[PDB]
Amino acid sequence: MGVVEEAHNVKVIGSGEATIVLGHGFGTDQSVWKHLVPHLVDDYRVVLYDNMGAGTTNPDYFDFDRYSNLEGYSFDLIAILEDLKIESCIFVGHSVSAMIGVLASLNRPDLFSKIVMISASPRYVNDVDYQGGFEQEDLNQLFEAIRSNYKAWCLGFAPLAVGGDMDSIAVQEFSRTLFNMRPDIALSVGQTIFQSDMRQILPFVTVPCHILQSVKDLAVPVVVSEYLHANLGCESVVEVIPSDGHLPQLSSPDSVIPVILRHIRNDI
Template sequence: MGIVEEAHNVRILGSGDQTIVLAHGFGTDQSVWKHLVPHLVDDHRVILFDNMGAGPTNPDYFDFDRYSSLEGYAYDLLAILEELRVTSCILVGHSVSAIVGMLASINRPDLFTKVICVSASPRYLNDVDYFGGFEQEELEQLFEAMRSNYKAWVSGFAPLAVGGDMDSVAVQEFSRTLFNIRPDIALSVAQTIFQSDMREMLGLVSVPCHILQSSKDLAVPVVVSEYLHKHLGSDSIVEVMSSDGHLPQLSCPDIVIPVLLRHIRFNILD
């Protein structure tokens, strides 16, 4: 196993001509794809990894400067693909990792046949003629809550993000992966994500993008999916699912997994 593979806990499952890379979002790790993976491994080569800073990674490897922008994560993704000698893949990216995948595809469009985006947003802050869902004051309150009492923040944030109560399995799972992250790293990552504005790069994306969005998502309003569709430089398609929450692949697998499988197999350009 190479250095990059080991650092990101890379796992390669299944076999097939088509390689699928599954990239998780903030607060989770590769386990968030547990409902999808069994449906892929018979016919595909599946690559799973943990973003640097996620609970299963070594916190000593987290470079606060490198990951103060999303480009650091895009370079990591490209480094993983290079070390594994991947020449073509479908990327399924959740939340911030969908945007990271787009960034990586701008640098190396030859590596990606398409990017499937689940709960993706180029900007979380509201702006003139743009509704991202948050005001700056709300984000400052979120950051302060993380800073002052991380455990209490997780207990409040997890059910809101997932769209359920603390008794649900999905909320307990998201709480577990959030608790596994070192609090100062979680705060830094949250600040990088929620303060980012990636709207200007959308027009540079040339690979097809499939935009999948929950009908109700605390973090990403439905109008954001239409914004992505309108401003991407590539062919794109939007599907709003009847799922609830920002982690629909975890909270609503019966709804979301069939949709993901259909988009993995369906090509916009066909």
């Protein structure tokens, strides 16, 4: 199918102009969309892909310099869109993919008609005038746990990230995909994402954004949604969902999928 499409496990379901591209967050893969895709395929051409470094990708292709900032991932996204000859899409970005889509839209705004963000944050680290949810010391302890015993870290982190019942199928799934990453890649990518800062480029975004999140999200205080809405230079709307978890489209589909669908199907 071509090296880029093989390397990112690209799947295309359907045909036609109206196209939706779905990008996943850290520690999971395109399977995170399993409860959303069934409701899209009758009305849209649906494109799924995996971020390089996901456990479903070949670690030999993980270039630590290319992926030392989010720009490397945004170049991959543009490459996939171009390889598929997509002239315009709705982009649904989960977690880090929301910012990867934003960055891609700075370089090629023509390729995106809308960005729908789920569990997005432009900055996780707190400062005296900004609540991101984490103090640097707690990120440091997280990285040390990853380095010291990756499996043990995965088992303890997955229930916290997913929320809900610690024995749920979604917790089991995310524990598996987390541990599917190569431990050195997980550590490097975790540092790159948790230390990122996208706040300063938000005024330059022009593609309209829909900002969705669980009301209880381990890595995204609700004030972050309001920050994105206040500082994005594009038209935007916020909807906080009465759900728990950072992967709510996987773990609470009954309450979460209808919200995502409304924001995909309706413009601001």
